[PDB]
């Protein structure tokens, strides 16, 4: 059987390789968005309105 090498990564990436791709099953147009900010990190110094945070959008 030929089974050329490129087909191997192509199928394991698209045709059900025996894994899952980097937590994308748990995801949520494109979701990487490593998002971080604490209450004191911004509210006390950046002076952000206490209603303005959260506010999903």
């Amino acid at each position: 059987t030929p089974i050329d090498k490129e087909f191997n990564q192509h199928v394991i990436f698209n045709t059900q390789g025996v894994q899952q791709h980097i937590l994308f099953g748990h995801g949520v147009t494109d979701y990487n968005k490593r998002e971080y900010g604490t209450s004191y990190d911004l509210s006390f110094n950046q002076k952000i309105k206490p209603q303005t945070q959260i506010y999903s959008k």
Binding site: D41, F44, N45, K47, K49, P50
Partner: protein, 432 residues
């Protein structure tokens, strides 16, 4: 010449001291780095370094580095003294035994030495101000231990306590009824003044007044900062009638065992509705005495009134102050105890309230803060004791305490003293 020393222990204490000191520096015009722009009304909270910044007369305590180092990394890193932010090694984990008997022993001595060093610099020390969380392990633990040590170390110096008790239905932890009771016993004989600072009572105030449907702890702390500033502005700003902290343990506690009081603050308005409201002295005085406006989840209509002290700031007039007091006395739904014919101590300050940018409160020309001693506080103790015993009957969660080095019999006197206090409050309310 007159200075006060602030103590902040526990997560709640740290997170309220942060806001209070932010408001203090903003009000006094001190930059976050600690230096005045320069483009003697600050000795009460800051001490000159001879040439340079102002350093606060405050100390921070916690057995976890999470809250402490965040302040160290924040914009206030140059303001606080590096060695007076005490950080521990292990969290108390909501346990009274650890914070009072095992791990607080080697940390309290360092705190005592730091307080010694801080107080030696001061020459006209007035009193103490402690902020602690009761429903927490290290909050109730060290606070009790520090109060015990202070009461024998300094003695006659007055101390005022702003404690956060658990709310009736608003709650986070499950083992909070246990360590809440013990801290009350510890502070009963050692704290001259105690103020209730529960969370639910402020939660409803926000929705009713500021129309805030999604509040967080930041709104909670800023209001308490306003309360502290309105309480202590008499020391550092001029006014018609100056009131020291001395006329608190002299005008509000008829008996030594009766020193639990609760406060209220008015006006509480947003930035949009400020321009459409009269906001005269009569209205703000009436709003303070409204039962729903109280800072503690307790209805005064179930008890009498023993002594109330209210402090006015801004451009108030004695005529307006006296006129509202007469109407309050005339109106019926508020009642006083028979053996106290006069029950008002009023102080006047000329400085208008200082508003922090980015907050919810609007700029106002007048405000009033009052502290009331009533007999209705026995209700919150009644519901706390019931919750305590209802699960203490089966001795649940006790092994977490006794196995750390705690005597089982300690709960025995913690129960009986609280009942004695409840019946003291009940007996005081009977008429002659």
């Amino acid at each position: 010449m007159r200075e006060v020393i602030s103590i902040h222990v526990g997560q709640g204490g740290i997170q309220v001291g942060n806001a209070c000191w932010e408001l203090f520096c903003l009000e006094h015009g001190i930059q976050p780095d600690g230096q005045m722009p320069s483009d003697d009304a600050f000795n009460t909270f800051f001490s000159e370094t001879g040439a340079g910044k102002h350093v606060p007369r405050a100390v921070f305590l916690d057995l976890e580095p999470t809250v402490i180092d965040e302040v160290r990394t924040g914009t206030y890193r140059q303001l606080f003294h590096p060695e007076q932010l005490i950080s521990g090694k292990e969290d108390a984990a909501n346990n009274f035994a650890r914070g009072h008997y095992t791990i607080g022993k080697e940390i309290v001595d360092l705190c005592l030495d730091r307080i010694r060093k801080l107080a030696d610099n001061c020459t006209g020390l007035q009193g103490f101000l402690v902020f602690n969380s009761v429903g927490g392990g290290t909050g109730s633990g060290l606070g009790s231990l520090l109060l015990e040590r202070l009461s024998v170390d300094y003695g006659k110096k007055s101390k005022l306590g702003f404690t956060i008790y658990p709310s009736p239905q608003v709650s986070t932890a499950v083992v909070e009824p246990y360590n809440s009771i013990l801290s009350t016993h510890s502070l009963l004989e050692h704290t001259d003044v105690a103020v209730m600072l529960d969370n639910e009572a402020i939660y409803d105030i926000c929705r009713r007044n500021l129309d805030i449907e999604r509040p967080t702890y930041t709104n909670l702390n800023r209001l308490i900062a306003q309360v502290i500033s309105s309480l202590t502005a008499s020391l550092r700003f001029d006014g018609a009638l100056n009131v020291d902290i001395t006329e608190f343990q002299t005008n509000l506690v008829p008996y030594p065992r009766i020193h639990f009081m609760l406060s209220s603050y008015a006006p509480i308005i947003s930035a949009e509705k400020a321009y459409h409201e009269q906001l005269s002295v009569a209205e703000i005085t009436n709003s303070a005495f409204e039962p729903a406006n109280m800072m503690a989840k307790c209805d005064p209509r179930h008890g009498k009134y023993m002594a109330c002290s209210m402090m006015y700031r801004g451009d108030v007039v004695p005529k307006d102050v006296n006129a509202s007091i007469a109407t309050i006395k005339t109106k019926r739904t508020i009642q006083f105890v028979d053996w106290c014919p006069t029950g008002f101590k009023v102080g006047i300050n000329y400085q208008p309230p200082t508003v922090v940018p980015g907050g919810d409160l609007a700029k106002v020309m007048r405000a009033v803060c009052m502290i009331s001693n009533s007999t209705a506080i026995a209700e919150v103790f009644s519901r706390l004791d019931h919750k305590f015993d209802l699960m203490y009957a089966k001795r649940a969660f006790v092994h977490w305490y006794v196995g750390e080095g705690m005597e089982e019999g300690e709960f025995s006197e913690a129960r009986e003293d609280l009942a004695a206090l409840e019946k003291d409050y009940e007996e005081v309310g009977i008429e002659t």
